[PDB]
Structures are given as structure tokens and as C-alpha cells.
């Protein structure tokens with residue numbers, strides 16, 4: 001596919017820089033994908049409504065109901081816009097949590113960091129899946145497909161590099177994922 005005009009080599013971009021800490025690298029990248037997705041979803045919010053998306057899905061057979069096991073335990077079957085708002089607000093709350101993503105160098109990453117990072121990442125994946133399945137038309141109208149595709153490719157190379165999401169969670173975009181990159185024959 002076509003990459004954005006300003007993108008670089010994504011396979012190299014996701015590798016852990018020599019001398020850098022793994023937890024910190026995942027933290028920096030996770031913050032970045034949250035921003036990339038926030039940016040992309042923002043461009044199509046007027047096309048993702050209560051009426052266009054009465055439920056959160058990535059194709060009919062993959063429906064998502066929101067729950068975070070703390071504030072909301074009983075899964076909520078809401079519209080995509082509300083589901084994504086719940087989701088992104090939840091991810092942002094984790095990112096702003098000083099005990100999870102330490103703002104001070106004298107504070108180590110918590111023991112459950114990786115687990116929290118993986119949970120964030122698997123959830124962010126769902127926004128890409130909904131966008132591709134329900135709004136690729138609006139993406140094409142804005143002529144921003146390169147941005148969505150490059151961001152998604154970057155995201156997938158990153159999670160594959162560190163095995164951060166299990167294959168099964170990626171089901172709705174597995175075909176696309178298998179097409180990413182290329183066999184050198």
C-alpha cells in the first residue's frame with residue numbers, strides 16, 4: 001500500500017533503541033499510538049454517530065460492549081461513539097496515572113506495567129478495527145487513507161515486535177495484517 005509522504009522505515013522504527021529500557025520504550029510507543037488514533041478518529045467523528053453506529057463493532061460478528069472492571073463492571077452495549085469515548089477516556093486516565101506511567105525518574109515502572117500496557121494496546125486496536133470496517137468510505141473521501149494505513153502498519157509492527165496482543169484479538173483485521181510489509185520473495 002501507499003505510505004504517507006512523511007513516514008519512514010516502520011520496521012526499524014519499532015525496534016528497541018540500543019541502550020533504552022523496554023518498559024520505557026513500550027510506554028513511549030503506547031502514548032504515541034493513543035495520539036495517532038485520537039488524531040485519526042477525530043477526523044471522522046461527524047460520520048460516526050448514534051444513528052450510523054448503534055453498537056460498537058468491527059463487522060457484524062465482532063461486537064464490543066464496554067466495561068473496565070472498576071467504574072463499569074456490567075458490560076455496556078452502547079453506540080460506537082460512546083464506546084470509543086469510554087475507551088479513549090479510560091486509556092488517557094491510565095497514561096496520566098503517575099503510578100503507572102511515572103513522571104519522575106526516581107520512580108520505577110510498576111510490576112503490572114506490561115499487563116496495563118497490553119490492555120491499553122488491545123483496546124486501542126478496536127478503534128482501528130471499527131474505523132476500517134465502518135468508516136473507510138469517509139477516510140477515502142478525506143483522501144487520508146495513507147495516514148490510516150501507515151498508522152495501522154506502524155501499530156501492528158510495534159505489537160508484533162514485542163508480542164503485545166494475542167492473534168485472536170486481532171481477528172477483525174487479520175487479513176489486512178497478513179498483507180502488511182512484504183515477502184522478499
Ligand SMILES: [Zn+2]
Nearest residue numbers: 048053080134
Ligand atoms: Zn462508527
